[PDB]
UniProtKB/Swiss-Prot annotation, chain A:
Residues included from the entire protein: 657 to 707 of 908
Modification note: Sumoylation mediates kainate receptor-mediated endocytosis and regulates synaptic transmission. Sumoylation is enhanced by PIAS3 and desumoylated by SENP1. Ubiquitinated. Ubiquitination regulates the GRIK2 levels at the synapse by leading kainate receptor degradation through proteasome.
Protein residues bound to L-glutamate: A33, T34
Family: Belongs to the glutamate-gated ion channel (TC 1.A.10.1) family. GRIK2 subfamily.
Other comments on record: The postsynaptic actions of Glu are mediated by a variety of receptors that are named according to their selective agonists. This receptor binds domoate > kainate > quisqualate > glutamate. It does not bind AMPA without coexpression with GRIK5.
Tissue expression: Highest expression is found in the olfactory lobe, piriform cortex, dentate gyrus, hippocampus, granular cell layer of the cerebellum, and in caudate-putamen.
Subcellular location: Cell membrane; Postsynaptic cell membrane
Superkingdom, taxonomy of origin: Eukaryota
Function: Ionotropic glutamate receptor that functions as a cation-permeable ligand-gated ion channel, gated by L-glutamate and the glutamatergic agonist kainic acid. L-glutamate acts as an excitatory neurotransmitter at many synapses in the central nervous system. Binding of the excitatory neurotransmitter L-glutamate induces a conformation change, leading to the opening of the cation channel, and thereby converts the chemical signal to an electrical impulse. The receptor then desensitizes rapidly and enters a transient inactive state, characterized by the presence of bound agonist.
Oligomeric and partner information: Homotetramer and heterotetramer with GRIK5. Tetramers may be formed by the dimerization of dimers. Assembles into a kainate-gated homomeric channel that does not bind AMPA. Can form functional heteromeric receptors with GRIK4 and GRIK5. Can form functional heteromeric receptors with GRIK3. Interacts with DLG4. Interacts with NETO2. Interacts (via C-terminus) with KLHL17 (via kelch repeats); the interaction targets GRIK2 for degradation via ubiquitin-proteasome pathway.
Protein known as: Glutamate receptor ionotropic, kainate 2
Gene name per UniProt: Grik2
């Protein structure tokens, strides 16, 4: 069934899911609006994203 | 702020610093941060593969 | 989505043109005009899928 | 319309019909319509399914 | 999503509270407490209800 239907899908589907794993590198626009927002955001999962 | 160009139709985000100096109209479009990553072309890695 | 920013025009304090342009853009939004354009320059090639 | 309240704070989408009548603040919760449907209940439970 | 319509609060046509509330809500968006504000009344009560 897997061979016939080939439900290929990356394990990441959410920001928290992205934060849990570390194999795939992350990032955003350097000195961009997004990363500046990540400053002081202090969400329980986005602080680790900032680091 | 100097009123040289009164209208500012442009993709300028409504930020607190900008709003202090110039007022913005209501957002025609509400943008937000998302996650960008390639299309999932699944590959099966050995032990997980079988 | 992660955040909920917004775009728009820049106006001075209490610009009379702002309070009419906001009504105009609300009218266009409720008329659906701003969405067909919001998809016009996006689907340049669509989604080519074979599976 | 009659200034009993100097600020009418309440959950209400910004609309063209009201904006001309009374002023609305910036969108504190952007949203829209959506479609709700029951989760697909597969026939997974049941040890006799084999 | 289907529609593009965000909530708002009533304000007199020339009330100075309009710009003050605008500044306050942009500050709330920037600081990020609006996310937990949404969560407390939307996701916080669903802490055991999740599947």
């Amino acid at each position: 069934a897997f061979l016939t239907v080939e439900r290929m899908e990356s394990p990441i589907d959410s920001a928290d899911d992205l934060a849990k794993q570390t194999k795939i590198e992350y990032g955003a626009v350097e000195d961009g609006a997004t990363m500046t927002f990540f400053k002081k955001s202090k969400i329980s999962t986005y602080d680790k994203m900032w680091a | 702020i100097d009123h040289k160009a009164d209208l500012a139709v442009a993709p300028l985000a409504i930020t607190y610093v900008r709003e202090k100096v110039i007022d913005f109209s209501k957002p025609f479009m509400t943008l937000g941060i998302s996650i960008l990553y390639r299309k999932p072309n699944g590959t099966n890695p050995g032990v997980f593969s079988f | 989505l992660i955040d909920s920013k917004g775009y728009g025009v820049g106006t001075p304090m209490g610009s009379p043109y702002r309070d009419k342009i906001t009504i105009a853009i609300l009218q266009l939004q409720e008329e659906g005009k701003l969405h067909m354009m919001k998809e016009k320059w996006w689907r340049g090639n669509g989604c080519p899928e074979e599976e």
